[PDB]
Design a protein around this ligand. Sequence first.
Ligand SMILES: [K+]
Ligand SMILES: [K+]
Ligand SMILES: [K+]
Lengths: 469, 470, 470, 469
Amino acid sequence: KLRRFVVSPYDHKYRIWEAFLVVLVVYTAWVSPFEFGFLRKPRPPLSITDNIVNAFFAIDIIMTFFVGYLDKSTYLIVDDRKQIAFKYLRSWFLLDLVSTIPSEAAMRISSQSYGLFNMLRLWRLRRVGALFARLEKDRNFNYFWVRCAKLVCVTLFAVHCAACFYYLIAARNSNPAKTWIGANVANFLEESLWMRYVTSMYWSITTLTTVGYGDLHPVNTKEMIFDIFYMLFNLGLTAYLIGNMTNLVVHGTSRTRNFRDTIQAASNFAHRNHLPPRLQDQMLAHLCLKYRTDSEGLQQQETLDALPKAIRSSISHFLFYSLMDKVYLFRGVSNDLLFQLVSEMKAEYFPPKEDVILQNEAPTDFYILVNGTADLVDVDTGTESIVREVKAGDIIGEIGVLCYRPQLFTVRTKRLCQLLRMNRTTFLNIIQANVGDGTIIMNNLLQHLKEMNDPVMTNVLLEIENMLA
Amino acid sequence: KLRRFVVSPYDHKYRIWEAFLVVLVVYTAWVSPFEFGFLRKPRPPLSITDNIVNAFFAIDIIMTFFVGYLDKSTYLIVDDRKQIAFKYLRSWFLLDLVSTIPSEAAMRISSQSYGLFNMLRLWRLRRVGALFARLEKDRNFNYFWVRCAKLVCVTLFAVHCAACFYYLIAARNSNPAKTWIGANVANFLEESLWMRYVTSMYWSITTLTTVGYGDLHPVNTKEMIFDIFYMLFNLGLTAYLIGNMTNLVVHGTSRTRNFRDTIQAASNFAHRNHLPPRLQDQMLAHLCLKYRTDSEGLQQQETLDALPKAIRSSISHFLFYSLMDKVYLFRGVSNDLLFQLVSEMKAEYFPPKEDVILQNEAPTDFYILVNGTADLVDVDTGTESIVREVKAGDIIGEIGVLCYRPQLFTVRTKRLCQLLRMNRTTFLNIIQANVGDGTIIMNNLLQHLKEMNDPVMTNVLLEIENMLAR
Amino acid sequence: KLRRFVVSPYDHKYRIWEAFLVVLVVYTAWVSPFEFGFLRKPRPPLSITDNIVNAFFAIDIIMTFFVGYLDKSTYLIVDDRKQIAFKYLRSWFLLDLVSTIPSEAAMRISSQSYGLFNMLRLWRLRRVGALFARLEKDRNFNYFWVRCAKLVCVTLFAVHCAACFYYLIAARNSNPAKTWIGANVANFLEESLWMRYVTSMYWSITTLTTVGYGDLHPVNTKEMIFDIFYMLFNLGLTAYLIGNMTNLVVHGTSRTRNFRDTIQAASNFAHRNHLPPRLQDQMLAHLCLKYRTDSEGLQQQETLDALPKAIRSSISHFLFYSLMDKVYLFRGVSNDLLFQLVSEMKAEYFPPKEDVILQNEAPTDFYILVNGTADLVDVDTGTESIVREVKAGDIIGEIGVLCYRPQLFTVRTKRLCQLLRMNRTTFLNIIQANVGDGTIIMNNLLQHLKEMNDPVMTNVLLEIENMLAR
Amino acid sequence: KLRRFVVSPYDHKYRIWEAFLVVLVVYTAWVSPFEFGFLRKPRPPLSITDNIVNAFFAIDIIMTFFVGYLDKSTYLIVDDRKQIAFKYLRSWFLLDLVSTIPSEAAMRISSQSYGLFNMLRLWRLRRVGALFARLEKDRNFNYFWVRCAKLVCVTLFAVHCAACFYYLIAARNSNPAKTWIGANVANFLEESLWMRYVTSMYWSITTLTTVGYGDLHPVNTKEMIFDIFYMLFNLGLTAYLIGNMTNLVVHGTSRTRNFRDTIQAASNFAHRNHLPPRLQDQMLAHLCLKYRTDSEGLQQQETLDALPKAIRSSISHFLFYSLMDKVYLFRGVSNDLLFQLVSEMKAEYFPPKEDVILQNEAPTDFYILVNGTADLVDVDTGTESIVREVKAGDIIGEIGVLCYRPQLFTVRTKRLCQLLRMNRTTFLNIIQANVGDGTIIMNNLLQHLKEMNDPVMTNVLLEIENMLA
Ligand SMILES: [K+]
Ligand SMILES: [K+]
Ligand SMILES: [K+]
């Protein structure tokens, strides 16, 4: 909400009027050069429908005294009346007023101004450029076709205004039979205005595209000099289009590059030894997944790190705080302190049949599995049978990090599973803050090892109570 | 496994039929625009061979009722004679139908709508579109060398239909002598269709490739306007080709200019340290070999590098088990033990006349020969003294690691070999975990020690019967 | 500091002289080829303004004896005339000398060697190549643009000298009517040098750009051969421009199409978790801000994080110390920890109207407000009663983060603010290692709580009097 | 050494003869199309100097019977003559022979073969392609100029053989005044051979570059059809050159591109806040070293990752084994055991003022400093003054890894230093293999503590005697 009698620039009513002036700009982008080159007085069929547009643009220059502008240093939308004006007047108000006087006025001060005056209205093209500069940054718009539509209007405009100048040079020549157009057609000054405009637009397009048939070409020095600069412009413009379409091509298929070679090199190597298909599908299943889970990890990690911990601690508080109470070890801890743990649990992804935590782990971190099924196995004499199959809700690596011993087992994954992480020194640093809970997680830690009837890991239970001793 | 009287889209005969239809589609892509331009009423030598193609496409638009379609929702061939029919009839049945009426019919409703009508049967180009779409997502075909063939086809097609349209503009004109072609050749209406077609195609390709000799060019506004749009099209099209062949080139050279980047780094590293030249070459003799055989696909270790040890060993076992079972050392042991023994070995190739394990050295590793051949040789009073050669499928330096005697004889690779490596430590930290079986290894070589009967070959007896008393 | 009567090449009064000699080089880059082609003997309007430029280059010939030069092995400005001279005299002193003799001298040895002689003084073009060589490594210049500006001058120079050579081939020809220019204009030898120079410059550029209208073209073999090489040169040159403009474009758009990859990833990530739309709002309100302000250069944290915490802290102390010493609770404490207390704070910008710390929230953090303004407001009875606003240079949420009471109020950023964060833990594990200074914080808070005279703000009085009881 | 009367393909005396035939190939690459196009019988001034080349190539046919070839499957140089022949005779011997017969022979077979026969010699062009394929993947040659030289010869060849065909079409026309060349030159069939060759070479070059002046252009149907295919070839060829020069440009500034942005982002941010130049360069004097080190570290790791251990263990055994006897801890260990440690000591680089190992860290690894000056510090309640400084030959992290204790001190790098590395479990699995040495490295570090005289040093020795318990 803003002050009375002020419209915000982001209003939808407004932004649907702004996009309507752009079609009026494409209109003057055509008519202004065409009048400059082909006309000398405001003839009716175009004077009428040009004083109209000079009202829709007069309406606008007053309708930006009631339009707030987003301040930049404070990102506030200014709605101070006497401050909007002083910014307008200081920036554009002069031009936008000058480029709206009807041509019939400038005619009265000097008959020789119709052409040049109407060329001032090309100042309105600043709205087209401001529009394109916004669409590329938008996300609901294909960056390809937006970058292509801007290349089209640029080259359609240069082709058109060049044709209008190069005809002007021939029209205001002293005697016309020595012009570039007077060479072919005898009396081009009597031909229809549609023929003349098509001819010059056709010379212009075949010089820009470097076809250069050579039927129409400069004949005297005035024309040769304009052409020298036109042909130079096109050399840069052409190199600019080719450079822009290469970048739209080699940077549109720039990801699938190092994902096909590998898949190729995979089955390539596979068929150099024609090993059975029962595993062909098995490995490529992992090749694609491990490409997925790292893309997902990378994207999530990058967006999560670019946010303040006052907000990122609301995502990691909305995704996990529910299943952070079913963990057997945190049952009974103060509700607030648990918030501090959930705020710091970097969720990592994992492709199936991979080892998250291996035997004799240096005590670094313990995980929490939010979804998927992981299975437990220990190493002994080189034969390893499954121990347990932990699924969503339980904790693994939980002991060795607490009692500062090497981790006792090794966890593997069966499906692509997502796991939380918790470095030891952080989780350790958190408890010494609120020590009023640091005892509670210790007993229900122990009550865990007693609620289980496993004999050889309750072995790992008695030597810790002499650690208590 | 589909119901009777239904054909799977993945059948073999069906795919050869589809390719046949694509060939016919190319035929119509040439002939439909050509009739629009250069012909006015169906004359025999084409009015026959197009009715034939119409018959074939009618056959297809009827037998596409007996073809099942996959579904991203299930990835399953939906073989029911109701959903198939209602997918076809709904999607584009009537288009493929209307693009099959013989022109000898449309002539009987309006003698004018002949060229424009049989211009309708360019709708068949959807089949070429689909063919290229499938060829892209494949792996026996170079993706860029297909994105490029699709561009040469679209280029040829544009060059062709532009020529036909332009000649049509010229022919329909009232006064023939004010046309682009009537300016050069006087009675262009009395020349062979061959000459007129070649002339117009000649103008068309000259303008598209921006040569523009200027002998043939527009003469009136009707032609200038067509040409304004043709030249605009080409500007975008050639900008699109150059963008696409830049892509093809970047990836065609990526490999050979990656190789020269590692060889560069392998010297920028061996220089900072002033490595001796005797040693600065063995490095490059192994990086050259690595890429020269990396291209072969034999080198392939990346696939194993990107795999978890859980799945990787499952396929490493598939290879070197049928070879390692014959080695005299591990003969007659538990299957589980030697299985993980396979898992902890790494392969490594060796250019010929190298030295994998030279004698009088610390017994650090022992190898398994998988391919190729090498040979033991003694440095006898500083002279080469060859010994028995070792073939593929045996063991090297095994006496050193399991007796800690320094290596007996050096080993030089005769040909380009490829061995399996297991160093002393990682082996010991396996056997002694389950010594219960490790004893079956000790006597195995011992029993093997009396298989050889030679003085120093029997010196292997006393030095293990040293630890009998030691 | 250097010796007497020596100028360092880095002098500022001197760089303005070198740059002056470049706009004189550009003069000879135009005049020397033009005289070769269109002129035969020095005529006044160009014979005087050409000896002038020869003076300013004779001056630089002596005034380069009093200029020190660097040395890659020393990076030092060697200033000893004996060693400076021999560097010049033996490198290219003579070339610069012979390219300064006035043409009125070489005239009086052989009247033929006029136009060819003053093509020698294109050797001065080395100064332009030197100039561009510096604008590369400069950092205040666009660099792709500098790579681009150098091709505009190359392609303008090639277009120019090609026009003067090609006219020379025509002027020297025996019969003038069989020349490329004599075929078009009859008496081309009786036209203004303006007309002839524009014509030949016109041909030269409809060939470089490959337009090739064909009005002016070679007529005899001597011209065809020059043109064969000109058209070959251009093929390489335009292929080199398009390669360089592709480089300029790829790097000019990288930013905008990187910001699009960030926002894209930030929506996919929100989409997989089905995040509530209220929260999907906040993220993109902070990523857009990050790239807009990142564009401003305030966001400057990427450079900050790269350095080691040992040096990174050295800068962070330089900024937020003069701000932090004013905070009330850090009053009168030893300068050691306030330095290390600063180093462990992280900055984070906040778009306006974003609630950074809401009411009755668990006391997790506490901030220091660097730039901007925010204000606390209470959620009472559903009416948002604003309280005194906080300015840039004070502390928020401090009572909660120490007395462990759920947050006193909310805080909404009025404008775009930027704060310093320090959570409860990382702070506490620092003070409790330095308890000897911690009470100085404890009493400062209370003493501060007495200077305030408020009903509930003095509940923090009685609220903490348990801390001395409990 | 190889068998008698056999030359290896790598012999210098031979590879200096192969590079001489290539200039004879560039000779036939010109003469053969020119004879096909402009001559109809072997005139002297070119028949003599063409039977010569057909001797230097006959000689070579003999010589490749005494030239070993690299057996790819075994990378050996084959030597048995009976095998060299059978590979030649089966691959190229026919063509290389059929393209050597002097043109005077084929003349006696049929007068009309002179043109076509001499075009067979273009088979010799296989040597040029084999040469370029070698120069590219060589290292002593600039990859840029090698790919530029290959693009020049291709276009110089297409331009030349197209000119020779397009003249053949005009020479063999029934009446000559209806040709592309007979249009301009009244009677071209009596002009010099140099004028005619320059004309057609000039038409060919304008069409290839798409200039197309239009003075010379197809006049009839056979010419139009040749041109349709020539102009099509050029469209692909031109797109191939532009694509090849973009790749040589945007892929030659590939590092340069990722590096300057970080540098300017520093100083521009530094000038954003105009902090003193004292430390302004100090940080800028680090990003370089940080970059200079990740590159060296990346490349050494890349080229040690590609070699067999039996060789990589000769580099590390040459760079470090000399200074791995001054370490106080390994003084007295058996010699061959020390070899095994030097084998697995991954050497890492480190920019200055960075911390290789930080306080209270679970035992993971201990390093060895080969060069540079590192300094030791400890976090005592946040006031860290240096304890000692270490230089080449001192070990750090030596304690925590050996007694399973959190790390005691924190090492910083007072300059750019290179550091060895040794993970705990690897170092542990090694002594467990030959325990005949574990006792003397276990204890000799204790004397190091008693050779140390610090009161707060033996505090960790103060549980070493119940470490005996
Ligand atoms: K052209
Ligand atoms: K032309
Ligand atoms: K062109």
